[model samples]
Target: GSMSTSELKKVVALYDYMPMNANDLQLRKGDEYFILEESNLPWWRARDKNGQEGYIPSNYVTEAEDS
Candidate 1:
């Protein structure tokens, strides 16, 4: 619903994530993303550095550590 500073925090892709839908978030291995919002398992909304936003598979990314 509302926004927060944590939403602006960045995460890193753990693997190359190709979108299953045209509107879904696409990411490459080691890419960084700003989390726009959270959701139920396997789905998250995020924005790239360039401001492109879409739904991504939650398992595809991590909190930018040990990855």
Candidate 2:
């Protein structure tokens, strides 16, 4: 079997606070993100250019990079 790999999704805000993914923040402007894998539980993983892996709410990030 092959390992599954997917592009990590960024927070819609692009620049929000990084909580411990254990808070009760609003979702309307979900642009903010914390531990990432907090709510979605099974959402995309965000990997910065430096190669940082973490959970990111599906609603925040765009389909792909703007380029």
Candidate 3:
């Protein structure tokens, strides 16, 4: 099996996030992001428009648009 990488979904940050660790992504209010992995956990893997990836608190962001 092969894994594919592409823009899975879009999300918008509801609040600002100052990374507490190297593995956390900095999120600004109203910033858009591409969801990489929704681990079904408290943290979700996402990539910002700048092409940086890290773990973000799932509660801090919401779907950017409705499907």
Candidate 4:
């Protein structure tokens, strides 16, 4: 399903993203992250491998198939 709010939805970064603020996440290309929260805005809350949580630009990532 497209854009479904599945629990801990996974997403992969399509490009590197540098945090624009302290609440923003730093994303690296090809890295997979978990969606913590997604609203009706351009930013989505995500968590990295190290359990760091922050907001990321939604355009920088794509949903990953569950494995």
Question: Against the hidden true structure, what lDDT does model 1 obtain?
Answer: 0.73
Counted clashes in each candidate structure: 0, 6, 0, 0
Model 1, total clashes = 0
Lowest summed lDDT across 10 adjacent residues in model 2 is found at 24-33
Which candidate tops lDDT? 3
* Global lDDT scores for all candidate models: 0.73, 0.42, 0.80, 0.79
Residue range with the least summed lDDT across 10 consecutive positions in model 4: 1-10
Error of 2 at 14 (Å): 4.7
Worst 10 residues of 3 by lDDT: 1-10
Q: Give the residue spans of candidate 2 off by over 4 A.
A: 1-42
CA RMSD, predictions in order: 2.9, 7.0, 2.5, 4.7
Error of 1 at 16 (Å): 1.3
Could you tell me every candidate's TM-score relative to the true structure? 0.70, 0.38, 0.80, 0.76
Q: Alpha carbon lDDT of residue 3, candidate 4? A: 70
Per-residue lDDT of model 3, residues 1-67, tens digit only: 0278655787888899877877788888888788888666968878887788887677899887776
lDDT by residue (1-67, candidate 2, tens digit) is 0245233244444334354664423332324333333343545445433345555555454444344
Candidate 4 residues lying further than 4 Å off, grouped into runs, are 1-6
**Candidate 1 segments exceeding 4 Å error:** 3-7, 65-67
Model 4: lDDT of residue 4: 58
